[PDB]
Amino acid sequence: LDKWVCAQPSSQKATNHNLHITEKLEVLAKAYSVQGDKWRALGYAKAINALKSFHKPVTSYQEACSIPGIGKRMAEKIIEILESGHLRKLDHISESVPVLELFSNIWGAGTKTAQMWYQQGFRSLEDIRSQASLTTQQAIGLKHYSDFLERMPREEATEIEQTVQKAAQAFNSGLLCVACGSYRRGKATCGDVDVLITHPDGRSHRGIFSRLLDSLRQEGFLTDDLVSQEENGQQQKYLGVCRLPGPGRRHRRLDIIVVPYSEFACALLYFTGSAHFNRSMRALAKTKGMSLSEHALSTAVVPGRVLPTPTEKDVFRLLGLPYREPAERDW
DNA sequence: CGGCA
DNA sequence: CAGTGC
DNA sequence: GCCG
DNA sequence: GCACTG
Ligand SMILES: O=c1ccn([C@H]2C[C@H](O)[C@@H](COP(=O)(O)NP(=O)(O)OP(=O)(O)O)O2)c(=O)[nH]1
Ligand SMILES: [Ca+2]
Ligand SMILES: [Cl-]
Ligand SMILES: [Cl-]
Ligand SMILES: [Mg+2]
Ligand code: NA
Ligand code: NA
Ligand code: NA
């Protein structure tokens, strides 16, 4: 269990005894990430979380290797940093990385698009604005480039959640609306607001997206849509942009998901995160012959069985994990 | 060797 | 499908 | 990158 | 691990 972050409280990271290592490794991890070397970047990310939660400063190659998530190669970098105070590789990162990071911070442009723009000679957002062929999503991402990189005070996230909740409950007073993500995990600032909507009668969540989005558009609250499949009535998620009324307001990202009550615990667990907490818990489930999604915890396919999970605690229990409140899932 | 949700 | 983001 |  | 685009 020591090897699974989802089995451990994330508060272990608040006492990082190895910051002089992790701040350097994070530079490299991001360099691999924006260049598209996603699995190497994942290994770095996991190693950083292992170093952040370790109980003491690492001081030997043997100690480092013993830590789950640190191997020979990562141990060698750790030993370099301690002796020399520096990591030579940081002076030999691809010169494209700063521009790739600039470009992949456009919403809807990932590593493949950023690398293509770089190959085509683009180096600035002015080059993108004037010369690139943007998708509809990427054009919205660029228009809101700075605002999507800002985090909002959690008090503003509360206002946004309440705006959604009031619009929803206006046409069905029984709808339950909960802000998840970093808000539910108790963070002081939030990159966006992630709102989960359900109805305890098990049926009246159906079809609400059309009414809800139209309502939020009527009041001018929604300003742009990034993902919203409104054509066939099977919509599960909305990703877009909102802005509260009055002066001094920024455009803020807003995510909504609507789920049947029978899936509430698994949807709440997914949407609360964190992302690395979810990936850890889902990996653990696989080792136990199970599969965990926002819909269900289910046994391996043959057509698996859906396990009964009325509450988040039941998912933890079925995976043999001690329960963690949302604030302790911040991996 | 291959997954890594 | 590949690419993208939650 | 690391893991089984 | 899933739901989106085009
Ligand atoms: O890769 C991901 C990203 C998110 N998620 C889940 C967990 C996350 O907490 C939730 C909302 O995604 P956000 O991108 O909104 N992240 P979060 O709310 O944790 O942080 P932020 O403050 O940046 O929005 O979706 C994943 O499972 N995998
Ligand atoms: Ca979100
Ligand atoms: Cl590099
Ligand atoms: Cl619950
Ligand atoms: Mg969020
Ligand atoms: Na190790
Ligand atoms: Na992007
Ligand atoms: Na974010």
Domain ranges of chain A: 5-91, 96-149, 154-263, 264-328
Nearest partner of A182 among A163, A208, A156, A212, judged by Cα:
A156
- Work out the angle between the directed axes of helices A38-53 and A275-287 (0-180°, nearest 10): 100
* Beta carbons of A9 and A324 less than 8 angstroms apart: yes
A35 pocket-lining for ligand 1 (C-beta < 6 Å): no
Query: Distance between alpha carbon A114 and the CA centroid of its chain, in Å?
Result: 20
Residue A192 assigned as binding residue: yes
A306 DSSP assignment: B
As given in the structure block, the two tokens for residue A75 are: 């141990």
User: Structure tokens of A1?
Assistant: 């269990």
State the helix-helix crossing angle for A97-104 and A111-119, rounded to 10 degrees: 130
Q: From residue A91, give the alpha-carbon distance in Å to each of A24, A86, A95.
A: 11, 10, 10
CA A97, CA A264: separation in Å to the nearest integer? 41
A274 lines ligand 1 (CB under 6 A): yes
- The first and second tokens of residue A154, run together, are 């959690």
**Beta strand extents in A130-211 (DSSP E only):** 152-153, 176-179, 189-190, 192-198
- Report CA(A128)–ligand 1 centroid distance (Å): 27
The ligand that comes nearest to the alpha carbon of residue A254 is 2
Mapped onto helix, strand or coil, the DSSP state of residue A253 is strand
Q: Let me know if the fold of A154-263 is the same as that of A264-328.
A: no
Q: What type of residue sits at position A293?
A: S
Nucleotide nearest to A282 (CA to C1'): B5
Residue given tokens 């966006």 in the structure block: A192
Instruction: Tell me the C-alpha distance between A61 and A58, whole Å.
Output: 8
Q: How far apart are CA A106 and CA A101, in angstroms?
A: 9
Phi, psi of A33 (to 5 degrees): -65, -50
Largest Cα–Cα distance of chain A, in whole Å?
Answer: 65
CA gap A329, A272 in Å, rounded = 8
Which CATH architecture describes the domain A154-263?
2-Layer Sandwich (3.30)
Residue A190, beta-bridge partner list? A152
* DSSP β-bridge partners for residue A194: A255
Encoded tokens for A74: 């990562």
CB atoms within 10 A of CB A84: 9
Strand-strand pairing, A237-242 and A222-228: antiparallel
Round to a whole number and report the distance in Å from the CA of A65 to the C1' of D4.
16
Q: Which long-range contacts (CB under 8 A, 24 or more apart) does A94-98 make?
A: A94/A31, A94/A35, A96/A35, A97/A30, A97/A31, A97/A34, A97/A35
**A141: nearest Cα among A130, A157, A125:** A125
CB-to-strand C under 7 Å, chain A 256-315? 275
Instruction: Determine the 3-state secondary structure of A312 from DSSP.
Output: helix
Q: Which residues pair with A307 in a beta bridge?
A: none
Scan for tokens 């990996």, then name that residue: A283
Tell me which fold the domain A5-91 belongs to.
DNA polymerase; domain 1 (1.10.150)
The C-alpha atoms of residue A316 and residue A331 are separated, in whole angstroms, by: 16
Contact A152 CB / ligand 1 (< 6 Å):
no
Q: Determine contact, residues A164/A256, Cβ cutoff 8 Å.
A: yes
**Rounded to whole angstroms, how far apart are CA atoms A146 and A132?**
19
CB A72 within 8 A of CB A82: no
**Which token pair is A71?**
């191997």
**CA distances (Å), A86 to each of A21, A62, A77, A90, A278, in order?**
9, 20, 9, 8, 33
Q: What's the token pair of residue A24?
A: 């350097």
Which window residues (128-167, chain A) lie with Cβ within 7 Å of strand C? 141
Cβ of residue A326 lying under 6 Å from some atom of ligand 1: no
Q: How far apart are CA A287 and CA A218, in angstroms?
A: 48
Identify how the structure was determined. Answer: X-ray
**CA A309, CA A263: separation in Å to the nearest integer?**
8
Which nucleotides in chain E lie closer than 7 A to a protein CB?
1-6
Resolution stated for this PDB structure, in Å: 1.6
CA A282/CA A82 separation, integer angstroms: 35
What would the two tokens of residue A159 be? 């206002």
Nucleotides of chain B in contact with protein CB (under 7 A) are 3-5
Q: Are A243 and A250 a contacting pair, CB within 8 Å?
A: yes
List of residues 6+ apart from A137 with CB closer than 8 A: A107, A108, A226, A227
- Active site residue ranges of A: 77
Distance from the CA of A13 to the center of ligand 4, in angstroms? Answer: 25
Q: By CB neighbour count within 10 A (0-12 exposed, 13-18 middle, 19+ buried), where does A208 fall?
A: buried
Q: Distance (Å, rounded) from C-alpha A221 to C-alpha A215? A: 9
What CATH fold (topology level) applies to the domain A264-328?
Beta Polymerase; domain 3 (3.30.210)
The CATH superfamily holding the domain A96-149 is 5' to 3' exonuclease, C-terminal subdomain (1.10.150.20)
Angle at A187 between CA A69 and CA A68, to 5 degrees: 10
Footprint of strand B on the protein (CB under 7 A): A 39, 42-43, 275, 278-279, 282-283, 286
